[PDB]
Amino acid sequence: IRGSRFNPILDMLAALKKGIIGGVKVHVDRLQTLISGAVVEQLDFLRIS
Amino acid sequence: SHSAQDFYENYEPKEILGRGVSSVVRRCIHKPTSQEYAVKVIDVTGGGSFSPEEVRELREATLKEVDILRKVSGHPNIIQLKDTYETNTFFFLVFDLMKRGELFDYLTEKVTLSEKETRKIMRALLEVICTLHKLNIVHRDLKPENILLDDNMNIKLTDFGFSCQLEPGERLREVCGTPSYLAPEIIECSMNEDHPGYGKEVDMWSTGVIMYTLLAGSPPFWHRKQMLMLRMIMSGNYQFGSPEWDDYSDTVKDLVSRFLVVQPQNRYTAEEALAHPFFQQYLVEEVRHFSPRGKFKVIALTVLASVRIYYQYRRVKPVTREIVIRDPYALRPLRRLIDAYAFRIYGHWVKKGQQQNRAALFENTPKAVLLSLAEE
Amino acid sequence: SNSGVRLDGYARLVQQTILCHQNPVTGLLPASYDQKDAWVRDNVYSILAVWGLGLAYRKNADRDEDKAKAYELEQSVVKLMRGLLHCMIRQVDKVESFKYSQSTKDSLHAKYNTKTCATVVGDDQWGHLQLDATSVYLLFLAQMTASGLHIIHSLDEVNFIQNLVFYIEAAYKTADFGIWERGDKTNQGISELNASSVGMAKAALEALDELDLFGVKGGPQSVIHVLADEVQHCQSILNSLLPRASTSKEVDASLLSVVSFPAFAVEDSQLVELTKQEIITKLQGRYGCCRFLRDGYKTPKEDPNRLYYEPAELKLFENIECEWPLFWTYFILDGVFSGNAEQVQEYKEALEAVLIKGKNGVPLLPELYSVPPDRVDEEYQNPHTVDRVPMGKLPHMWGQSLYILGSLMAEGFLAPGEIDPLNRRFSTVPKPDVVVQVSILAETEEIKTILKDKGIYVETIAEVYPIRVQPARILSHIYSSLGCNNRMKLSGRPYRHMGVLGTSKLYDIRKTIFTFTPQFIDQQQFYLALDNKMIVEMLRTDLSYLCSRWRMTGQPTITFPISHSMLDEDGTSLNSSILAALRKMQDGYFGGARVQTGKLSEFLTTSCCTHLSFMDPGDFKALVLQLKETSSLQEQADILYMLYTMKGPDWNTELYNERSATVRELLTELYGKVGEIRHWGLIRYISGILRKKVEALDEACTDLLSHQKHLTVGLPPEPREKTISAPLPYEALTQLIDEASEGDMSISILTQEIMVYLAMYMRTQPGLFAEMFRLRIGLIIQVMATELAHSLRCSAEEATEGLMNLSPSAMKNLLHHILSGKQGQWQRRRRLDGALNRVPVGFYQKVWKVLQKCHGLSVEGFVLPSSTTREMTPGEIKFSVHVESVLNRVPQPEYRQLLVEAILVLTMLADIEIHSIGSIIAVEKIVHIANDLFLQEQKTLGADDTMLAKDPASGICTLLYDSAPSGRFGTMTYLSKAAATYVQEFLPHSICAMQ
């Protein structure tokens, strides 16, 4: 933020909340809902080694 | 007189602790250290109902009060001004938080006080008064309602709204305060403009009056009519009740008579009062030397005290229920219980002002045809 | 691994204990034993262990077998959830009926059936009123959905849930039978308020604020909308009555559930430790804890074959309340939840000793332990000493499941953050403060010019065309359409008033911004908004109220349009109070909050906004002539009232030949002329004709009742005087107050006004209502008239005329004056005290102690038997009611005050002696003896006969009334002497008093 530099980040966060960033659709929500019900890839090689 | 932003971002108000004529006291915290305090918010505009001369004079009065309390700060038994904030409409005065209320509720709940705490409060008040007089500063506003109590029975003077500096050689001719606490000199200033003025004597009279009202339980001078009360005060014929002070020492009564003197010159000062034997105490000393007459006198006094202690113990009377049938007021426990029960039954008609007072509850007068003669 | 073995063992235990009677198809477990029923609360509570073990399985599965196990457990959970939801949805008609008015007959059944989902009992054979079960059901439904598990399928069920939300939203002012299905303390069930139901309801309403039921793949209309005023009202109610469960029970152990793992709704944790210490020190036993004092359930007395307890519970239900280990197994979870471990070990060790081992060697929780029928006398002398034996039903699935969940939590397989995804554990975190934003608008150009003259820059109603401002009643009419379905006969949310908490936040309706003014600037409802002082006062209290809680995100926003009525008499300047208030919320400090002003353009970028989706498209002629020709507002009101009462309730007067002028139209037009003159001489008169009602009167009444207080409407005497001991609906309240006020019309308005005055007064200063147990509006009114007559030295009619002409600020000031309490002096004060019967704080306790050592206290024939002391306790209300009734037989206030003084002097004098009188005491005789002694002493002194006067109907000298109580000549000495003489008169020739 460093003082007066705090405006453009506010504008970017507001645009991100709006839903579109230069023609790209975006979604925002809590991490717990997103991680739930999603495929997670497994790294099980360390257990064998 | 800094900006209100500092007060807004430094102190956060809390629930109300009390109310006044135009100001309310609220609790506040200091964010850096989390220390509790009490803040007095004064509305100089008076809710917008004040003509601007009134606002200006209130602002001048509060500025005089802050700059006169600035010098006095330092005494352990005085209120400490921690921070000041000024706006166009409000003054924020931050003092120490005490804990409980002032003397009125304590005296109402306990009816009357004993000599043990009386000695301490009188000593502290005399020390504060002597310190104030040494600084050439007067108060003219000792009332029991301006003395706060702590959890360890600590008293500090507050409400200096009438305090002002006294240039030496000057004689003030202003009249203020409750009429019951008005010294004869102030009232003489009222009737006659030729009187030179008054001084610290009004302070001694106020100390005597508060001592009287804490000891007896009722003010020495009080009546339903202001004019007759003023004539009562001018006469200076305070009397001692018969079945009320038969269990008090002679030294305290002598001190009572010494505090209240009509003549301003004969009134005792703080230094003279502090030297009375009532406050006498000893810690340790080994330079007691005298003649053999002194040894005989001391041994005779010891023997006399040892003999008298048993006889004083024997002078107690039983319950005497038959005497209760005749007269219950004679016995001290019966009197104290009747008084306390009467106070708790009728405890919410004692407030500020001359209209209602503690003396209105007691009726020691023999209600009869003698009530026809009241005044001229 | 060890974890696999432990979890397999726990699954085996759960399967052998609970899942063996899951009862598929319907999916509802039987309510234990051979009862063949299904209680909602037990069914809801029996699934927490399964849910927790399933969540434990899900995170560590990583294998087909454990994945399938978690799938099966989850599908069992959803099957039971849907089965229970079917019971609710099958009975929409009762919900619709209950949505309007409150009664037990249109309430939902509490015990549903097995297969075919039928009813087992009618509406008059069981207690069908339990808000706690429905609230806890919704709370676990919300938690279940937030966990990520689908329960809801169709969108119609969303409408049903929305309707049920309104069904339970009035729990703060609706009495219920209770969790125990036993009504009040004693039997013959009478519906009464309890803290447990509202404590459960608050969390359930909070949980469903925005939680969508369709998961992450929802739509525009998938979220349940709830208000916020009800939550804060419930919080205030629970805070007021937290220490005691209700007005009849000193404590109920069920308060633990509210202040533990389920439905955290509590603030100021000091109260939490206080109630925990109190319940520990009062209800702890040897092998369990009691529900509450003096419950006879499952006792060797009482004839369990019979119900409707006879009023003879003197000692047959004392110190023999059996036990309940459910509250014990609550303690282990409560301790293990936040940060406590040693207490958890202590409680686990204590509970392991009271366990019983059955088949296959598995834990089993007994219901209660009963006192042996023979060892009963010993317990009365040595409580909590005699051993007990198990007795009754003990497949208790509730406590068993709770203990299983607690053990699983303690083992560490599951984290506390998984049971509650909504993070309800941080309710004790303080919130520093909030900043309030206020915008000021001018109605017309003239007002804008006037404000700009004094240096205030405001903007008119125009020029902000994108932004529109409307009152709140249109917003209520808008909200009256949420969740409306025609096929299922659902009428949507009923009409109700709004708090200021709802109007502050901005709104969006069809790509448009709307702002709504607060409801207290409405002059079309009542006339208290015509006074500037009260406008200022309600602004101050409302700003304080918003600054206090503000549990929503974003800064508030308040619109305060300045009206034409806010100008002075000449209409060229605003009033001094309004200008002072404006200068006051300038500089950022007004009332008890920080106020920042500006323009709506800047507040738009930083303010909470709500998107709304459900409004998206899918000879009388001679009298009339006399009225027309005549003048004066007085005769105007008289003739309009006469015409309305006689022939003109809705008949057209035909006064104007072109427009049909109805009596109501003329009456409502007269308000415009009345308001300009500021004449409080007929505005109340016309308001009585139109019968205007003040909003939120029921809220004021329930706030009055929640303070352990009894209300009473009407002048004396009985039987037209009433007693409102329980909350009543708005229509019932209005009918009752109208019946009490009779045809005096203005009495109803005055009662409403004084009730509202008390209503905003007790919240600010709840300290002047001490020394009082019962208030009467009529008695206060007569005292007001008497005081005004004495002040003005006029007749009663002139005093009434002056009182009815006072501005409302004057009534508030005089009410405060007489509430503070601030010959002719002493007698007046004694009369006031007798009128307001301000009995001391510890009066009833002293009366009880004296009654303990005497046969009774006779007062002019009527006697109070000493047998009352053993069937009743000083803490409860009935003794106070009986004592006041006995003391209220005499009508003269001076008599009641002297009676109080004499009985109190009896109380003090009884302590000195140590004896039993064994006789009845006549207080009137003592008073007469004291009076005779006083008269004899005064005659002995030498007083002339004039001052020893006699009252026309007393036999008591007026100088005795004028006499002060204390002193060497006070009435206390005479009363004490008379009481001592009377005691000696009935004493065996020996006093033997020592102290």
Side-chain angles (χ1 to χ4, degrees), chain C residues 874-897:
Chain C
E876 286 169 352
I877 301 287
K878 294 290 296 314
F879 182 76
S880 175
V881 166
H882 294 88
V883 161
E884 299 280 17
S885 176
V886 163
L887 278 159
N888 262 321
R889 310 304 292 195
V890 67
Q892 293 82 17
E894 297 175 355
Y895 292 172
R896 83 182 72 245
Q897 193 156 354

Short mmCIF file of all heavy atoms in Angstrom, two decimals, chain C residues 874-897:
data_model
loop_
_atom_site.label_atom_id
_atom_site.label_comp_id
_atom_site.label_asym_id
_atom_site.label_seq_id
_atom_site.Cartn_x
_atom_site.Cartn_y
_atom_site.Cartn_z
N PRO C 874 -39.90 -17.60 49.96
CA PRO C 874 -39.88 -16.14 49.75
C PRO C 874 -39.52 -15.72 48.33
O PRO C 874 -39.99 -14.67 47.87
CB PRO C 874 -38.84 -15.64 50.76
CG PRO C 874 -38.14 -16.88 51.26
CD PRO C 874 -39.13 -17.98 51.15
N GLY C 875 -38.70 -16.50 47.63
CA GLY C 875 -38.23 -16.11 46.31
C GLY C 875 -39.31 -16.04 45.25
O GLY C 875 -39.21 -15.22 44.33
N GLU C 876 -40.33 -16.89 45.35
CA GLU C 876 -41.36 -16.94 44.32
C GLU C 876 -42.35 -15.80 44.48
O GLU C 876 -42.32 -15.04 45.46
CB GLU C 876 -42.07 -18.29 44.35
CG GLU C 876 -41.28 -19.46 43.80
CD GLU C 876 -41.93 -20.80 44.11
OE1 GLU C 876 -42.91 -20.82 44.89
OE2 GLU C 876 -41.46 -21.83 43.59
N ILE C 877 -43.26 -15.68 43.51
CA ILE C 877 -44.13 -14.51 43.39
C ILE C 877 -45.40 -14.60 44.24
O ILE C 877 -45.90 -13.55 44.70
CB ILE C 877 -44.49 -14.30 41.91
CG1 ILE C 877 -43.22 -14.09 41.08
CG2 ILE C 877 -45.44 -13.13 41.73
CD1 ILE C 877 -42.57 -12.74 41.28
N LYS C 878 -45.93 -15.80 44.48
CA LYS C 878 -47.26 -15.93 45.06
C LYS C 878 -47.32 -15.34 46.47
O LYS C 878 -48.35 -14.79 46.87
CB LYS C 878 -47.67 -17.41 45.08
CG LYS C 878 -47.88 -18.01 43.70
CD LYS C 878 -49.11 -17.44 43.02
CE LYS C 878 -50.38 -17.81 43.76
NZ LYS C 878 -50.40 -19.25 44.14
N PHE C 879 -46.23 -15.46 47.24
CA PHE C 879 -46.20 -14.86 48.57
C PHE C 879 -46.30 -13.35 48.50
O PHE C 879 -47.02 -12.73 49.29
CB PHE C 879 -44.93 -15.28 49.31
CG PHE C 879 -44.84 -14.74 50.71
CD1 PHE C 879 -45.59 -15.29 51.73
CD2 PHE C 879 -44.00 -13.68 51.00
CE1 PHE C 879 -45.51 -14.80 53.02
CE2 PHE C 879 -43.91 -13.18 52.29
CZ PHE C 879 -44.67 -13.74 53.30
N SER C 880 -45.58 -12.73 47.55
CA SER C 880 -45.70 -11.29 47.36
C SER C 880 -47.11 -10.91 46.97
O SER C 880 -47.66 -9.92 47.47
CB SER C 880 -44.70 -10.82 46.30
OG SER C 880 -44.86 -9.44 46.02
N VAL C 881 -47.73 -11.69 46.07
CA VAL C 881 -49.09 -11.39 45.64
C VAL C 881 -50.05 -11.46 46.83
O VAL C 881 -50.87 -10.56 47.03
CB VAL C 881 -49.52 -12.35 44.51
CG1 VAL C 881 -51.03 -12.28 44.30
CG2 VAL C 881 -48.78 -12.02 43.23
N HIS C 882 -49.95 -12.52 47.64
CA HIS C 882 -50.84 -12.67 48.78
C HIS C 882 -50.60 -11.58 49.82
O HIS C 882 -51.56 -11.06 50.41
CB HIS C 882 -50.66 -14.05 49.41
CG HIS C 882 -51.09 -15.18 48.53
ND1 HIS C 882 -50.24 -15.79 47.63
CD2 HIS C 882 -52.28 -15.82 48.42
CE1 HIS C 882 -50.89 -16.75 46.99
NE2 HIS C 882 -52.12 -16.79 47.45
N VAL C 883 -49.34 -11.22 50.07
CA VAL C 883 -49.04 -10.19 51.06
C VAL C 883 -49.60 -8.85 50.61
O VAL C 883 -50.20 -8.11 51.41
CB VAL C 883 -47.52 -10.12 51.31
CG1 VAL C 883 -47.14 -8.80 51.96
CG2 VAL C 883 -47.08 -11.29 52.18
N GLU C 884 -49.42 -8.50 49.33
CA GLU C 884 -49.98 -7.25 48.83
C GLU C 884 -51.50 -7.27 48.88
O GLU C 884 -52.12 -6.26 49.23
CB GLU C 884 -49.48 -6.98 47.41
CG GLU C 884 -47.97 -6.82 47.29
CD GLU C 884 -47.48 -5.44 47.70
OE1 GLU C 884 -48.22 -4.70 48.38
OE2 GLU C 884 -46.33 -5.09 47.34
N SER C 885 -52.12 -8.40 48.54
CA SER C 885 -53.57 -8.49 48.59
C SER C 885 -54.09 -8.31 50.02
O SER C 885 -55.09 -7.63 50.24
CB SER C 885 -54.04 -9.83 48.02
OG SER C 885 -55.45 -9.97 48.13
N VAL C 886 -53.41 -8.93 50.99
CA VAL C 886 -53.80 -8.77 52.39
C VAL C 886 -53.62 -7.32 52.83
O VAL C 886 -54.46 -6.76 53.54
CB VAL C 886 -53.01 -9.75 53.27
CG1 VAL C 886 -53.08 -9.33 54.74
CG2 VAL C 886 -53.52 -11.17 53.09
N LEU C 887 -52.52 -6.69 52.42
CA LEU C 887 -52.26 -5.31 52.80
C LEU C 887 -53.10 -4.31 52.02
O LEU C 887 -53.20 -3.15 52.43
CB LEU C 887 -50.77 -4.99 52.62
CG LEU C 887 -49.84 -5.42 53.75
CD1 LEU C 887 -48.40 -5.52 53.25
CD2 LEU C 887 -49.93 -4.47 54.93
N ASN C 888 -53.70 -4.72 50.90
CA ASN C 888 -54.48 -3.82 50.06
C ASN C 888 -55.97 -3.84 50.37
O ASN C 888 -56.74 -3.19 49.66
CB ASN C 888 -54.26 -4.15 48.58
CG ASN C 888 -53.22 -3.26 47.93
OD1 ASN C 888 -53.16 -2.06 48.21
ND2 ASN C 888 -52.41 -3.84 47.06
N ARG C 889 -56.39 -4.57 51.40
CA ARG C 889 -57.80 -4.54 51.79
C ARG C 889 -58.23 -3.14 52.20
O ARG C 889 -59.32 -2.69 51.86
CB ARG C 889 -58.06 -5.54 52.92
CG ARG C 889 -57.53 -6.94 52.67
CD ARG C 889 -58.08 -7.52 51.39
NE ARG C 889 -59.51 -7.79 51.48
CZ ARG C 889 -60.19 -8.55 50.63
NH1 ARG C 889 -59.60 -9.12 49.60
NH2 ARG C 889 -61.50 -8.73 50.82
N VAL C 890 -57.37 -2.45 52.94
CA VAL C 890 -57.69 -1.08 53.38
C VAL C 890 -57.50 -0.12 52.21
O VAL C 890 -56.52 -0.27 51.45
CB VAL C 890 -56.82 -0.69 54.58
CG1 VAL C 890 -55.34 -0.59 54.20
CG2 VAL C 890 -57.31 0.59 55.19
N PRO C 891 -58.41 0.83 51.98
CA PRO C 891 -58.26 1.74 50.83
C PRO C 891 -57.39 2.95 51.10
O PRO C 891 -56.79 3.50 50.17
CB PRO C 891 -59.71 2.15 50.53
CG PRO C 891 -60.41 2.05 51.84
CD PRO C 891 -59.72 0.98 52.65
N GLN C 892 -57.30 3.38 52.35
CA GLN C 892 -56.59 4.62 52.68
C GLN C 892 -55.08 4.41 52.61
O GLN C 892 -54.55 3.53 53.29
CB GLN C 892 -57.00 5.12 54.06
CG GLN C 892 -58.45 5.59 54.14
CD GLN C 892 -59.44 4.46 54.33
OE1 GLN C 892 -59.07 3.35 54.71
NE2 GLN C 892 -60.71 4.74 54.06
N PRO C 893 -54.36 5.19 51.80
CA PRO C 893 -52.89 5.02 51.70
C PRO C 893 -52.16 5.24 53.01
O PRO C 893 -51.18 4.53 53.30
CB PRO C 893 -52.49 6.06 50.65
CG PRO C 893 -53.75 6.39 49.91
CD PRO C 893 -54.86 6.24 50.90
N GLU C 894 -52.59 6.22 53.81
CA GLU C 894 -51.94 6.46 55.10
C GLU C 894 -52.06 5.24 56.00
O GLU C 894 -51.11 4.90 56.72
CB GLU C 894 -52.55 7.69 55.77
CG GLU C 894 -52.34 8.98 55.00
CD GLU C 894 -53.07 10.16 55.62
OE1 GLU C 894 -53.82 9.95 56.60
OE2 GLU C 894 -52.89 11.30 55.13
N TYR C 895 -53.21 4.56 55.95
CA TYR C 895 -53.37 3.34 56.73
C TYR C 895 -52.38 2.27 56.30
O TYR C 895 -51.77 1.61 57.15
CB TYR C 895 -54.79 2.79 56.60
CG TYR C 895 -55.86 3.63 57.24
CD1 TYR C 895 -57.20 3.34 57.04
CD2 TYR C 895 -55.54 4.70 58.08
CE1 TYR C 895 -58.19 4.07 57.62
CE2 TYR C 895 -56.54 5.45 58.67
CZ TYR C 895 -57.86 5.12 58.43
OH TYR C 895 -58.87 5.84 58.99
N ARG C 896 -52.19 2.08 54.99
CA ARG C 896 -51.28 1.03 54.55
C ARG C 896 -49.84 1.38 54.92
O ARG C 896 -49.06 0.49 55.29
CB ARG C 896 -51.42 0.78 53.04
CG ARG C 896 -50.66 1.73 52.14
CD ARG C 896 -50.92 1.43 50.68
NE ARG C 896 -52.26 1.82 50.27
CZ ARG C 896 -53.20 0.97 49.88
NH1 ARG C 896 -52.98 -0.34 49.84
NH2 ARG C 896 -54.39 1.43 49.53
N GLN C 897 -49.48 2.66 54.88
CA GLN C 897 -48.12 3.03 55.26
C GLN C 897 -47.90 2.83 56.76
O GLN C 897 -46.84 2.32 57.17
CB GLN C 897 -47.81 4.47 54.87
CG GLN C 897 -46.33 4.78 54.97
CD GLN C 897 -45.90 5.92 54.08
OE1 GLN C 897 -46.68 6.44 53.29
NE2 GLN C 897 -44.63 6.30 54.19
#
